[PDB]
């Protein structure tokens, strides 16, 4: 995934359709989602457990 995804401060819709479940972490890969204050739509598709 791009490492600059969280630098898009004007992003409105985010569509993740991968597998965010990494090794024994609470989805640390998307821990930068708090940066996007303009986010309106989120479409995670990664077979979430928690």
């Amino acid at each position, epitope marked *: 995934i791009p*490492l600059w995804i969280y630098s898009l401060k004007t992003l409105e819709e985010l569509h993740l359709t991968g597998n965010l479940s990494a*090794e*024994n972490n609470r989805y*640390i890969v998307i*821990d*930068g989602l*708090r*940066e996007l204050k303009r986010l309106k739509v989120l479409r995670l598709k990664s077979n979430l457990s928690k």
Partner: nanobody
Amino acid sequence: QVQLVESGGGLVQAGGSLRLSCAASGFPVMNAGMYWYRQAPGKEREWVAAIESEGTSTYYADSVKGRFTISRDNAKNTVYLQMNSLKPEDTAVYYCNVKDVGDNHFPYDYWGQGTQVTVS
């Protein structure tokens, strides 16, 4: 240049209070999101503390929620994290992290060297 360096690492038996710190170079800390991650032997990096830019709102994981205090000081251009009698099971190597500062070059996330705090 952009780099993170932290201090305050020291083995402390349960019953005291430790004060952490950091040091950000090349960018203001006010207009940037700072993060605290913990590293353990045989365990991956776990998020601990996050302070949101443009509004100064603190975010804590349920593992350590309601137990620490994190603040940003622009006078020293650093972030202070203070613990409250951290448990022996909380011993970890804390990592500083700030990602996507106003400057946008190839390194998008910056980490510190890492300080080991021991509790027994």
